[PDB]
Design a protein around this ligand. Structure first.
Ligand SMILES: NC(=O)c1ccc[n+]([C@@H]2O[C@H](COP(=O)([O-])OP(=O)(O)OC[C@H]3O[C@@H](n4cnc5c(N)ncnc54)[C@H](OP(=O)(O)O)[C@@H]3O)[C@@H](O)[C@H]2O)c1
Ligand SMILES: NC(=O)c1ccc[n+]([C@@H]2O[C@H](COP(=O)([O-])OP(=O)(O)OC[C@H]3O[C@@H](n4cnc5c(N)ncnc54)[C@H](OP(=O)(O)O)[C@@H]3O)[C@@H](O)[C@H]2O)c1
Ligand SMILES: C[C@]12CC[C@H]3[C@@H](CCC4=CC(=O)CC[C@@]43C)[C@@H]1CC[C@@H]2O
Ligand SMILES: C[C@]12CC[C@H]3[C@@H](CCC4=CC(=O)CC[C@@]43C)[C@@H]1CC[C@@H]2O
Lengths: 319, 319
């Protein structure tokens, strides 16, 4: 069967498809394009979809998914849908409210994985990034351990099959793992990970705790100018990556992706192009040799495309 | 990660690694060879091990598995162990007794999948195939539906995560699916399936019921003279199979195996040879084209290497 549909074990007894499909829509691209791409991803064997409250497209993604359930292509159970809790709902009493909005929007009866988008709380309200009239960002110091307890209850309530975090550093992660009364451990930490920021320490830390590293910007991001510095290196053009790709008669994208899979990372990818969507499904058809992995490991330069500078000087900034 | 370690969904919410490693030891081969092979299989990414009470090697296999858990190579959760209920324990009150012997032998705290080895009951006792002094096989007519209820309780008791059957024909399968009060549906039907006996009807039946077909003798069996007719065709020598293997620069074994995976079968293989064990791990590195699948589909000749003639004329003989 579709090898990219196959699953890996989560520490709570659940299983996640090994390859995920992101749903962020680029600034100048139309939101209906995500419906097109999602249906195509499903047709190509993609069973893991990553979204978020912040993305404002959960209505569209849920629509693409249900149409495929409707026409008998898949069952809810075949789909693994991930969503994320936004910073303005970090207050314990607001966590489930955020999730219930996602459920209402997607029309799915539960999310397979619900995660904390960032370890930073912002003032409750209707704006994603609330600032005062002088531009200061209105944040709060809600303890992650408190928001985490609210996340555990959403799992107990059956609204989320699994719970995890995103953009957490080791200190923040340790804070939750050592929390007294901890009932459910985070099943993953979704962070930026690619050839220029391979996260070997975080990967080692997660392995020792049975937490999986789910990577984003795996192919060097979408270079969306609203959030990616245009003077940053283009990952897929890297000479060493292109030489190796050439050596295996594969594309750089496939080599950048395979590298992650080979090191134990569950990667997220995104393409609104039908040829490229199909192309990524062949990542299991080859295998990098030790020497080549060591080569790619050497491309690391601790470079972030996602600095989270839109969070200004939040006392809890992970980076 | 090891693509042969990846999992497929079972109809009860569990997941099974896509490629299984059998543990039967050939007549003239030493039982300690299975400990060697199992450790090597684990080192190579095999996570699904198929055994049975009848095989008399559960003590050895459990030993190989635990050593790998003990040195930190895997966790119990990483391993999927299958065992089978022997015919002499078909009486409802004896089912759990058989399972508890397996648990005691393997020293695992539960089996991931427990299945009915054959749909034929034999008289209780210490001999696998009890016969009278005149030679007649001492069988019983215990209803499979009754033994099945005993299997459901072992699942409710937590002793077996999943339950299934083996060597059942469609009638016997339908008998259980239509049983009144059925609580748990069989997650699989482990039967003989290869190029000369592809089981297309059974495969279709299973697909419609969400029952997976787990195949054995996938490579044409071990040709063990105690149970395989030496005048039977050698599957891996088949001209058409060798031509196709040649066309993909792959071995016949890999082509015989890939064919099963491509049609939705979860295959079982077995090799006590370290080179061949490693060889089978590359089955995801290529893909047969439609025309080639149709070619291989044509090799079918409804030929069984496993006639179960050791069950003589049991009224419930599946074949
Ligand atoms: N948790 C967080 O804080 C966070 C942050 C950022 C992202 N994410 C997740 O990660 C997902 C992906 O992020 P991203 O889009 O910024 O990064 P990305 O996956 O690294 O890059 C996406 C870009 O790669 C291109 N691409 C896809 N397949 C390709 C192929 N085979 N060859 C060449 N190029 C290919 C796409 O172009 P085309 O469309 O033309 O194919 C697209 O522009 C997001 O949708 C989201 O779900 C999470
Ligand atoms: N449920 C049932 O009633 C039932 C019945 C029979 C079997 N089974 C299960 O199926 C498992 C396998 O059965 P089996 O051994 O009879 O049949 P099989 O898997 O079809 O054949 C095993 C033979 O194939 C050879 N082989 C393995 N890899 C090879 C490769 N890459 N190239 C060439 N040859 C290769 C092995 O030789 P080497 O060792 O030299 O590599 C071995 O002799 C059993 O252990 C058992 O778990 C279940
Ligand atoms: C920069 C931005 C806030 C942060 C967003 C970004 C879109 C992409 C994105 C995806 C994430 O999951 C993390 C937050 C970010 C990085 C948004 C585009 C406009 C908005 O102001
Ligand atoms: C033939 C036999 C009983 C049936 C056994 C066979 C070993 C292989 C085997 C594996 C199975 O799982 C089904 C039963 C069989 C086919 C045994 C070897 C000696 C014994 O008498």
């Amino acid at each position: 069967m579709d090898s990219i549909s196959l699953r890996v074990a989560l520490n709570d007894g659940n299983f996640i498809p090994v390859l995920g499909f992101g749903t962020t829509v680029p600034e100048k691209v139309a939101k209906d394009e995500v419906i097109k791409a999602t249906k195509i991803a499903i047709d190509n064997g993609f069973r893991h979809f990553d979204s978020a409250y912040l993305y404002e497209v959960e209505e569209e993604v849920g629509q693409a998914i249900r149409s495929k359930i409707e026409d008998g292509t898949v069952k809810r159970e075949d789909i693994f849908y991930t969503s994320k809790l936004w910073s303005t709902f970090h207050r314990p009493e607001l966590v489930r409210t955020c999730l219930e909005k996602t459920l209402k929007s997607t029309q799915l009866d539960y999310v397979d994985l619900y995660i904390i988008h960032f370890p930073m709380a912002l003032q409750p309200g209707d704006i994603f990034f609330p600032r005062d009239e002088h531009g200061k960002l209105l944040f709060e110091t809600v303890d992650i351990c408190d928001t985490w307890e609210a996340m555990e209850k959403c799992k107990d309530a059956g609204l989320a099959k699994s719970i995890g975090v995103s953009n957490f550093n080791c200190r923040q992660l340790e804070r939750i793992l050592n929390k007294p009364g901890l009932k459910y451990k985070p099943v993953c930490n979704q962070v930026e990970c690619h050839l220029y920021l391979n996260q070997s320490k975080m990967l080692d830390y997660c392995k020792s705790k049975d937490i999986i590293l789910v990577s984003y910007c795996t192919l060097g991001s979408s270079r969306d100018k609203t959030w990616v510095d245009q003077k940053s290196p283009v990952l897929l053009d890297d000479p060493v990556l292109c030489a190796i790709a050439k050596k295996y008669k594969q594309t750089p994208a496939l080599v950048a992706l395979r590298y992650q899979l080979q090191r134990g990372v569950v990667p997220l990818i995104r393409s609104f192009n039908a040829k490229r969507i199909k192309e990524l499904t062949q990542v299991f058809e080859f295998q990098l040799a030790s020497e080549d992995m060591k080569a790619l490991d050497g491309l690391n330069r601790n470079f972030r495309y996602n600095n989270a500078k839109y969070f200004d000087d939040h006392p809890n900034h992970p980076f």
